[PDB]
From a paper:
Here we report the biochemical and structural characterization of this M-ADH enzyme, which we refer to as BkTauF. We demonstrate that it is a novel sulfoacetaldehyde reductase, which differs from BwSarD in active site residues and metabolic function. Each monomer consists of an N-terminal domain (α1–α5 and β1–β9; residues 1–178) with Rossmann fold, and a C-terminal helical domain (α6-α14; residues 179–375), similar to other structurally characterized M-ADH enzymes.
The apo and NAD+-bound structures are nearly identical, with RMSD of 0.37 Å over 375 Cα atoms. The asymmetric unit contains four monomers. The quaternary prediction server PISA suggests that BkTauF forms a dimer, consistent with its oligomeric state in solution determined by gel filtration chromatography. Out of the four monomers in the asymmetric unit, only one contains the catalytic Zn(II) ion, coordinated to Asp192, Gln196, His261 and His275. Catalytic activity of BkTauF was abolished by chelation with EDTA, and recovered up to 85% by addition of Zn2+ and 15% by addition of Fe2+, suggesting that the physiological metal cofactor for BkTauF is Zn2+. Furthermore, the putative isethionate-binding site adjacent to the catalytic Zn2+ is very open, which precluded molecular docking. The present crystal structure could represent an ‘open’ conformation, and further conformational changes could occur subsequent to isethionate binding to form an enclosed active site resembling that of other M-ADH enzymes like FucO.
Residue numbers in the entry:
A (entry chain A), B (entry chain C): 0 to 375
Amino acid sequence: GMLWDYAQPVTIRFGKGRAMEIKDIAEAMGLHDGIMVTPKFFVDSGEAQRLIDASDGAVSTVFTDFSPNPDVTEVDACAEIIRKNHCEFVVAMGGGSAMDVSKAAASICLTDDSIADYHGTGKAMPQKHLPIIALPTTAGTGSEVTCVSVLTNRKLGKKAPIVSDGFFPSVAIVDPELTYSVPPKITASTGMDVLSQAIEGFWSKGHQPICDSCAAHAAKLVFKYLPIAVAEPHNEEAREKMCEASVIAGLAFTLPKTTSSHACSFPLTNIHGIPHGEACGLTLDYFARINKDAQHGRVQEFARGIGFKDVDAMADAIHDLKVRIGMRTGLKDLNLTEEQIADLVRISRHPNLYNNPVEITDDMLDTMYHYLASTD
Amino acid sequence: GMLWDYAQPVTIRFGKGRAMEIKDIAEAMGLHDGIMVTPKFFVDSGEAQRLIDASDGAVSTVFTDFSPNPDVTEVDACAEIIRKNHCEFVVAMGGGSAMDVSKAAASICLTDDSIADYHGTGKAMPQKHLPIIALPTTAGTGSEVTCVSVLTNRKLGKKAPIVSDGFFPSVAIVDPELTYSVPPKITASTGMDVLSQAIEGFWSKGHQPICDSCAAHAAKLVFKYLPIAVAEPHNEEAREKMCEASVIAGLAFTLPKTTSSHACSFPLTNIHGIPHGEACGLTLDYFARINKDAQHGRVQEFARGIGFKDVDAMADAIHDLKVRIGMRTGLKDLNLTEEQIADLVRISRHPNLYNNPVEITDDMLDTMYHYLASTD
Ligand SMILES: [Zn+2]
Ligand SMILES: [Zn+2]
């Protein structure tokens, strides 16, 4: 007998060109003077102004002063801009960073505190917030359907997530046109993020059947369309299918949580500069073979459902995909020392590691990292 | 270019025994003095009082005075009980009827109007409502995750649905134990409702990928577990799997809407007394063979995905399933006249018929109903 809780409060508006529907949402909610939180890139490309003009006054303010890893100071500056301009809703347009700034700011602007007071301090967030409209511009982190904001405190050397039900966007507009300009290398890494979220969401010990269905759907799309999107950045079908996979994989992993590849990805990114998606993909087929017979055949059933003979064939396809799109298959070029490998082993023991269906021991991590350290 | 809107506002608590969590939900919402809307069967069996006593005073009122086809007068009576008792939330425990009554009563109780003023009159419902906790006792109509209430006005001779965003339950508790007492003939019919909802939701012109994923998951479960649930009413695994299929098929059909089998089911139930799920099942394999090659092979991919060689093998299995569980394969025993057959043809032209991926003409309906009229 299974027990699970399923809650997915975000409304998804999917479709090419639908980023122009910000006005519709604001009008339906009776809100004015929105603030758009977006990286400077979309100001320079005229995308921001295009969407601002389309809002016919619904959005009045733009905030771009945040970093790819957002800081609590940038959230606090964003919240003060909200107060000064009396903003009633937040349009988060960008990758994970813009969305995580927006979730935090939309809550804290209603108070006179700093976001740091709730950053890892164990203190629960206030729950009243400005409505958030999230417009992902990559495919993707899936952040547009999560209630998590990952921030850093640079002055305090701390990086922790903040979880609050008030962080769920009200509407996610998933518009594939906003991804057409993502460069091939970033398309590849963000695509591997989707595939990792889907596969790990399915085989997590916290698996539940609705997320299972989303995971299989998204994974199948990535194998077919990710090579097309990397090789043909203006192939509209492949971009649309990657955006479909991205948002649905977001629905797949949010509740079951991720597992071994995500646990290992954090030191690969933070210490060695490997982008998140590529870092997840580095271990994805390795752990797939470890997990092949887990849960009385569930993963084999998954592999067959998305079109492979078995898990080993899916693992081969993961490797082949990585090679085709230029994602790391090894770490030999890092010339890792034994001390560095021991650091990877130690820091990879993250709570997510325990969601893997097979126990991943320290000796297994040591074996994996020595394997990667001697593989191109 | 795919366009779709996805919204699923219901929180689902799935699990054997979790109907005891009513008080935990009322606590979290800060609500008291709930009313339980449930058929007399559950009062007589002791199950209602078992759950009310478990709620530690959360539920103070019981309402059973409604019909298997609920009337506007019974909704109004429920709303008056709510007002008299200052009830703050509604617990709908039963099949489609109890959930239909509960949704409409929870909105209309905040007005001094009859629900009849909003029943097929073009007048939209007021949107404020008491929160609804839905506890389905069959697997199922899926009503615990829809915003639709189907009511009849016996004095006016009208049977029509009311659609309102305020009708969405706040929480759906899907506790398979509540289905253990469903007799085999009703288990069979409600199970065919699940299968039709899943298959029609998938091939509907309004199809969208999250609903597609849910549909395939639910349909696969029905083929395996519905014969077991019918043959073994206290097989806990089969009852749990049918509940999983039921709530997930509810997610599959709510947004894309149902199609030809549901359109035809309405006169089959309203004129000839055939229960809803059985009435949908009567035409499901028939329309499958008409629809098999629509949408450039989508339905064939669906059939293969859930394990059939093709749609015709799936339709064969739908037929074999109906025979095994005692569901109607024909209408010969009704000795239908040519006028009655024409009535079926005419009345089956419901708005949902145009959701079918292949145009269903009057000639095609005439052929189908003459076939059914000549088949055991
Ligand atoms: Zn990730
Ligand atoms: Zn139905």
